[PDB]
Amino acid sequence: ATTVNGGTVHFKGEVVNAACAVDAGSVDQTVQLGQVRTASLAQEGATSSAVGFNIQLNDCDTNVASKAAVAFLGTAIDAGHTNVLALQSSAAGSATNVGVQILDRTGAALTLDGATFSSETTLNNGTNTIPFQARYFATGAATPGAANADATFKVQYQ
Amino acid sequence: ATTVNGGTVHFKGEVVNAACAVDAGSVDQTVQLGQVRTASLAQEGATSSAVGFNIQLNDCDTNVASKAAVAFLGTAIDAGHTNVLALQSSAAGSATNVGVQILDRTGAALTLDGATFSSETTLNNGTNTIPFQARYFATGAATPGAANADATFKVQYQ
Amino acid sequence: ATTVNGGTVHFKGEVVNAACAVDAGSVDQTVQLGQVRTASLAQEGATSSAVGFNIQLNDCDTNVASKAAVAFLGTAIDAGHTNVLALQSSAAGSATNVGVQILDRTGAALTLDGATFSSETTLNNGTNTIPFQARYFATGAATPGAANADATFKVQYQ
Amino acid sequence: ATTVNGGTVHFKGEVVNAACAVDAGSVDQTVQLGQVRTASLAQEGATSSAVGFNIQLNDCDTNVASKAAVAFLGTAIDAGHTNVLALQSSAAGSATNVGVQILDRTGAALTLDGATFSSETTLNNGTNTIPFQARYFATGAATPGAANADATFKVQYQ
Amino acid sequence: ATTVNGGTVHFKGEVVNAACAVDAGSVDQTVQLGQVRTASLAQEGATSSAVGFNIQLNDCDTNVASKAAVAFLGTAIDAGHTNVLALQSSAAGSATNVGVQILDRTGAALTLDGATFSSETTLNNGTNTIPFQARYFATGAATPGAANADATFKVQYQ
Amino acid sequence: ATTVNGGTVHFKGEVVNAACAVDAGSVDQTVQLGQVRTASLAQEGATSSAVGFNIQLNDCDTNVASKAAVAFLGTAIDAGHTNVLALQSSAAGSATNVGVQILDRTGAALTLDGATFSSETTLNNGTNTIPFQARYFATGAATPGAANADATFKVQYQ
């Protein structure tokens, strides 16, 4: 009887030519690292506790590819720390001398060039979960502030 | 003492003469369908796994109306596929022979003309959620690319 | 106390005896198609990915009219391609053998003469948005250059 | 090295002895009102929906002045409607019985004599923005046509 | 080897001499009020449900200032309702007798004169978020339409 | 029946002979730096917190090129600071001794001559995202004011 305007729906997705497809919950996931004390990042090379995040793969076909690796891309904090993400929230409130390190399943920090892939993980037919960890890395004496960071990843099927 | 310029706030809303009001989280929502392999859309009529999204109606009054239906409006991929959304992100990166198909609570695909309303759902006083599903539809051999799409919906109360 | 002259303000608008009124954001809008590779437009009939744009109608009264259609009027690239917009930015830099195609909600290219109206969209009282898509159309081997174009539209109410 | 003629650049500006300075984007701005229906302006005194626009003040010094007001100057539509702008685009095609009203931040229409100043908004050090609204005013039965208008403003500092 | 023109990037920001700095996500934010029924705004003085939004301050120094207040500036709907924002989207389609009220942390509606600051909130070193609410206010029998509004705010530190 | 003039639509884009094409959302994008305090920019060489932005590439073909680099072009603040964007808003109200630095994915600031390309990022078939950061740079004691800036970029494929 009465018809009114409702609104808009935006659909996001991608068609890939690969052995697996990234889950809808892994393409744009947010990782809450929590707070970290300055006393825990009081020197160069100091690290915080790790926070785990996963990249799920769906509809995997082991006949097409047997192993999958992930390479992360982002802004590095320095020219001597290529495996540490630079913080980026705003222009005023952000921690200095602090970055974010992404660790593959072997526990090694991945360099953020978009070309160095992590350790290959064998795939099974179906749903695959690749484990990663993230932590704060101190390039000096840390100062308080926001510690948000962003990165993109690509998956290599071989 | 010290007063500085802060910024600007924009308020978006609508006043409707209807039995229900669309929730602020449903008037403009993003649905992340994730990725789909090209191998899963290798023929005309192929479909992917469905992703659900809801349209929430607030402050519903059953004395005004008891049933609600939703009609979507968007560009169609072809004249032979009038229930398949055409992808629209940019001029370079997009999947070909692929479209987004919107499913109502009965599993049928809705016509994207803004005049074919979904199955009517009984309303109760207060908050009502109308379930919907979105998937990918292949009008041929799919090719890799971005698969973003947009559509608008209206709500009919009777 | 101190009075100085500030400037000038210009107001643009129209009064129409129609069922709806075009929104202020739709009477003069810019659509960013983005870049497209010459490799994707390497032959006659080649098309690019589509970019969407909407023409919003406000204060619609379904008693006056229930269906709305839109015709477009611009310079055609050729007499054998009457649905392709010719590019026009300057005298030096522009793409050759490239045009702009406007697609209505059925996915069909519209003739650019201001007399071939698109598919009639059902109207509801209040805000109405009519979806359109724009893409690049190759009338030959495309060559690099700017690809700016423009057109005027008129709305038919019945 | 080939040297060719390039063209001409014209610089516009003004040196003011005032507390603030009008932004380069506010000295000459175009306000797009959109379309309005004759049915919404079918009687004397009928108003349309308002469209907002701002006049921005830069480099404000509160030590010189603390309050700024704006007076608008233009051709009135009648002797009994001195706060309604007369339309002016060309000798034909303009709307009759329609005018433009500039609304203060208190919602009151401003007299278009260049001497009635608006509400005195309080200034802060730095960028300052004064909100304004423009709407269509019907002095009779509105007729279709173009509804362009122009006005000039001066800023009072005290 | 192949160099092409990419595009343009625009950087927006402000340098302030204040105890805090407004976050990049708070200087220009959109608040989605959602829809409201005319039945909920059927009389003068009727209010809708509130939608919350925050203004975030970064790099706060409690040594410089301990309390922060926010004053909003915009066009008032009338002269008796100086705390109700006037709607402004286009010349047609907006709601009538409907406004937007901004409520501070104490629930009181703020006068939109740009000089009546909200309740003082104590600042802590680092990130501070000031809670605000926005609701709909009826100045009579509400009529259907778009209900967009805009306002600017300034932050006082003392 | 009733046909009225609707308005104008302008299509903007480019045809490029390159390995990738810049996304429509990256050809002309506005990034919000936010506010920054003069206390954080109180000396030459002082920097602010970084704000990230991306240049998305679409329809990438790794058979044409495997790496992409971006060079930015704009007005430098001084002769000794060739990698700091000069602020440009208007004849009044801008900040002094403040500029914008665009940081490569390696964390280094880029020279703004349109010929110093950033570090190459490996490309994959399909959508590619190149990360960048923007911050404020002080060439002296910063003064309050607006801090808007502009720059153009070009992409090298090799």
Author numbering:
A (entry chain F), B (entry chain E), C (entry chain B), D (entry chain A), E (entry chain D), F (entry chain C): 2 to 159
From the paper:
Type 1 pili are important virulence factors of uropathogenic Escherichia coli that mediate bacterial attachment to epithelial cells in the urinary tract. The pilus rod is comprised of thousands of copies of the main structural subunit FimA and is assembled in vivo by the assembly platform FimD. The pilus rod is a right-handed superhelical structure composed of ~3.2 subunits per turn with an axial rise between two consecutive subunits of 7.8 Å or 7.7 Å for the type 1 and P pilus rods, respectively. All subunits in the rod are connected via DSE, forming an exceptionally stable fold that is resistant to extreme temperatures, denaturants and mechanical stress.
